[model samples]
Target: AMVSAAEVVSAQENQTYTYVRCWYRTSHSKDDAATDWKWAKNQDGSDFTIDGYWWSSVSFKNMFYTNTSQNVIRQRCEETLDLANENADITFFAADNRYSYNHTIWSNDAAMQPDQINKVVALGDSLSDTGNIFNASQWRFPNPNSWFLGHFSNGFVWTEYVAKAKNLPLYNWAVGGAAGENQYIALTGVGEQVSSYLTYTKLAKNYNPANTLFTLEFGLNDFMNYNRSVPEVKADYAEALIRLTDAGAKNFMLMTLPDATKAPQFKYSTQEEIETIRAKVLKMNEFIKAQAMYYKAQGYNIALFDTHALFEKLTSAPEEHGFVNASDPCLDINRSSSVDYMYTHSLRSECAASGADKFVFWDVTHPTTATHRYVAEKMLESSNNLEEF
Candidate 1:
């Protein structure tokens, strides 16, 4: 995998630096890599900076966008670019790097309306929320008593941080206890409490279609609850997507579960069971990709980004991406006697030494906020010009 990480080099007036910093997991080993994060540094290995809130690892950047600054040398050494109208140099730096610092202009033949996004609605389980993602009670219920917190316990979840960082209004409808099929109830089914809160009931009226961008993320729990059939899960996902479309949402992005086959929660299962579920997950991802393309062709501005693929790459070859153990749960699976429930969040003792401690997983089920930041940053770096829009 080409490096989906880069550092903004503080270069000289006209001198260019060919040696760029790539994102790498700083974990010492697989066992110690529970909550993983990525960082950038110079060729000399100095001035490392954390990349935050990025696009999926699939984002492509190759071809320099024009940089409008002194002391900055933009670099693009890839073959793909996601943003066509963007011409910003990689040497420039900013938080919300979509406009001014960079800009995006969509063609008239696009699927849905561009520039229609101003707010984003995030709906999902504990992974979507710092509170549920790291339920102190969960530790007591599970196998490992080791202490841990949700990836975002140190801050807000990635979804929330992304929106805020982009200066977009965000409607977070994340319920830590949601399941895949159960999401329908909150997203758009009968009660659709979550969707209703954001749309029909005007819960977040301010950030509604009249104001924001909405992204749907779910299915993590589905893997746990819906072991019945892969087809059934796909149907539920399709139904949810349809409902959102009917609700006037045109810009949709979908994500898949990371490798559930490797998490310690399923450690008790036989290897055959793990492989079976893994196959199912792969099928689910295929379903999602197919549907995304179909919807896009049908006039819905849908974009599919598979987080599963990212995990796959990370797990299959951790060293390729500077990761040690990308499959195993980073945090304690048994939370009963290990973690300090009294503490608001969980962090390896290293967090005290290195401010932004990066681990593979913050807890058994979720990535740490630092991990989220690194992943988000990696996604953005890979996204290239798409990062602008």
Candidate 2:
């Protein structure tokens, strides 16, 4: 059933090709996602990127990582069904051939298409908040759009990218130093965010759930500061979702907890503490993935953005990803090293060191602007794969 490269045909002397066609399994049954390719385990990875289009494997990874709603993975495969027609020379059958790599053509139909968002309501902690106590100016570095409001990134956070790319009105209700609880110093728990949106923001903005995208990117503060149990955290998320759904919200987006054990904040923590944090993060991510699946099954448009996996992959293969250093922050004023210095004692006078964009972290726990940019791009890709845009 698997067709060989020779079966397709050798390239002519003068040919101007631009892509490769590779079939992959996309069955949703497997934990790693469907191996629904006519006959393939995974992508050949031989020609992942070509010209400017990326292979469906990347999209497949997006589907799996995000746990997209409404059988979006299958929908993506269906969308790519016509890629072969776009290119007469290239056809993706049940085939695996490295020799045909040069003539290979993969489908980028599932590639993320930007400019689709209308309105977005984001919820979370410091990671999503721009006006937190730790960093009020929010912009780590100076820029034209720098209002010093409440944002973690010096330039733009992930949500800001989606907002800009899609021209959506973003109502980021995330507060700094907020937990996913009711009784906190910030008093901005996940539930409280939803309550605030329904009581004030929704009315003020005249929001329509039919077109608005509701994003929840919280949990770090809950686990890091309060050491909340996995079940408790999930319960909070469930409550928030319920309240939002009751308030007529249709589209829901969630982000997984990043591995903070690798952050500089824990650089002085004991190994036992680090392991404990890792376990908690893993549990939280698992809960999020399940929640995405559950919500999708119930016919709600929902997705779980796997920030954990994205960060983990970046840190694991920093050089391959064009990262100079993925382990520590590029700007840490207290690090006692001027080379990696950017932020002094104050949060307002923030500036990047030379080539700091090449690093992954801006500070120990937060991501750099470059990393945020990458995340926002990936988020768009995932949304495209899900056909949300």
Candidate 3:
């Protein structure tokens, strides 16, 4: 019942339809065998496989079979296909480029130009660390090498992407479950991460003020703990930056706290709890912005990337950005704590069945590789000018 790429080409040789290649998560009725679902790829004009059947690029929409009611299935099909089209790793053959290329998808100024930066240092929580990759046993498949790439996502985090894009050697001094202070069990708070880097990290031994970019992204776990007051959070962040400033660090970039309310962990929370979290995030961001302004006035180079806005935009209309579900974790959620709570109690089997790219969140708080790419792209765009910071 599936069509091949050649079949599609011949069927619509004179017709107009864009060609795309990318990984697609396919599924059938919920009652199907566990092995009936998976991630399939469409590449080099080949047919895309779904539920053991091969389908043409255009035939996918018609072949997408779901267990939901007729109307619900139709809507889900449209949503999934929309996600497919939006998220594809796009390219055009020379013959197709004449009519297929679209400039809007790419930025006028490409990311990570050679002259943009030379050396970089990044600080944050688990969101930025490649030093402590995820565990393999925690996943459905027993690869033991999946999530432990030292970053939280299935692929590269924003810092790694920035380093790769700018051709800079990045020294990421972030730890998992870190906060603004020494509260977490790991004691890898923002202050600790910065202090340790300045005190011992070999990367900080030879600093270059002219060509180095210092970026700090924190406060997610800080606010989540709810133990630290707004002023305390601000003071902790200020202290970290001040320490860096005293250490001859010139260029600096600060990321606002992302909107945690959009995360799947908060799905079970009450309205009041959500509001409280939102308020905390806003206050934290307000302080960060003010601090950046103050430092700039003091003749220090600093820039603030508004992650809050970026996350809000993506969550509001995920389909527009190739995401089918933004409010839920792609992985099964049993616990939302910083430790292996979710991994320990996760439905890895179920998630594997559903496919990773279909959901935005990988755990209750972390994002999938797709979201990471989106974040990195946006951050690179915002941090184009190092001097502006």
Candidate 4:
């Protein structure tokens, strides 16, 4: 049996009561083990903070469920609020104010195995933060922005979602409009290439002893801007992975770019060019896999997750995967249209009206909450190699 929020409040003063979380079980994940983002609490328990404890291994799937002995859960502090006469029912809430949150729980307080050092960091562009509250574009949405508030679609995003689903502490440093070549730029922008390096440095400084995982998703702009060769870009990326491996990060997860040629935003690539680009991306994935294998032979325990497959799977059966329009956008053409305008402006509306996933493709360039959920779901299903409990 589990303890209820209402029961927790009326108990005897100074009496100890074990509270069981009542929110949707999806609210928690393995990443909760490391305490990523903090949610806001209401005064006097009008709303309740979900104790991570109720989250069970069953979250992965019915088949994956283990005995309760394998259950690991976390608890959030409860804030109670007194209504005029009675305590209000518990509801969801987020932490107030701006604060930086980082959770790197790779080993015990003392030490960890070498394989435990393997870390994976997913670094990318606006696509990653389409629905993040901190994202400026996301702010364009009206208040009570609850579309994908704490739960992004890419199951593995929204720190809260991915941490639990993948059972790993994901270093989610994805930002809007990020560039890999701009690693040295000094602009007031939030998601530039160089700043990414800085964030990685802080996280890498604490690389676990078991090795680490890294996934780099960039180059869309490179193709559009500099026309850099795929080999050149991949080489730089490969070198970066090697550097991280040398610095204690030996595990890797590589994602080939999604159907870039099909994006309504990128009107540049032709059919022939798209196929060529896809081939190049395949080669890149091969490179990443080869690198991981090479390092593994060296006893690094490196591995790669085929994000390309996940993306491809979703693209073909967007509807089967819970998307409203698998092949196109709900709002196709509008004056505000850019590559990502339609998804950003109409995602929530479409999801509500059409029962679509708002956490997916917010625009041609970014992902919505639904899309993130897909990734998270797929990741949870495929983490034997990519995820580490």
Best candidate according to TM-score = 3
For each candidate, how many residue pairs have backbone atoms clashing (under 3 Å)? Answer: 38, 17, 12, 54
Tens digit per residue, CA lDDT, model 2, 1-389: 12233421231112232322333323211111112122122233233222221122211210001112212323333455434331111113212344222121212122243433456778987666633332222223222122112234444567766765675545556764421222223456788677656543321212345566888877777777777887888899889888888777778777887787777667767898788779988988888888888878988887668889988998899887777677765544344232222233322122233354576766555676677778878877886664743
Model 3's alpha-carbon lDDT is 0.54
Question: What is the per-residue lDDT of model 3 for residues 186-294, given as tens digits with 9 covering 90 to 100?
Answer: 4467886676555332211122444568888877776666446777878888999888887767778778888888887787677987888789889999888988888
Give stretches of model 4 more than 4 Å off: 1-120, 127-160, 166-168, 176-213, 224-226, 266-276, 319-324, 330-344, 347-352, 358-360, 383-389
Residue 291 displacement (Å), model 2: 0.8
Segments of candidate 3 deviating more than 4 angstroms:
1-116, 132-146, 178-185, 201-205, 334-355, 383-389
lDDT of 4 by residue, 265-378 (tens): 445446776676667667666776676577668875444556677777777777666665554433332322332321333333454466435324543444554565566556
Task: Please report the TM-score between candidate 3 and the true structure.
Answer: 0.61
- Listed per candidate, the RMSD to the true structure in angstroms reads 15.8, 19.8, 17.8, 12.8
- Clash tally for model 1: 38
Model 3 residue 128 lDDT score: 79
The lDDT of each candidate is: 0.43, 0.52, 0.54, 0.40
Best by lDDT: 3
Ten residues in sequence with the least summed lDDT for candidate 4: 61-70
TM-score of model 4 vs. true structure? 0.56
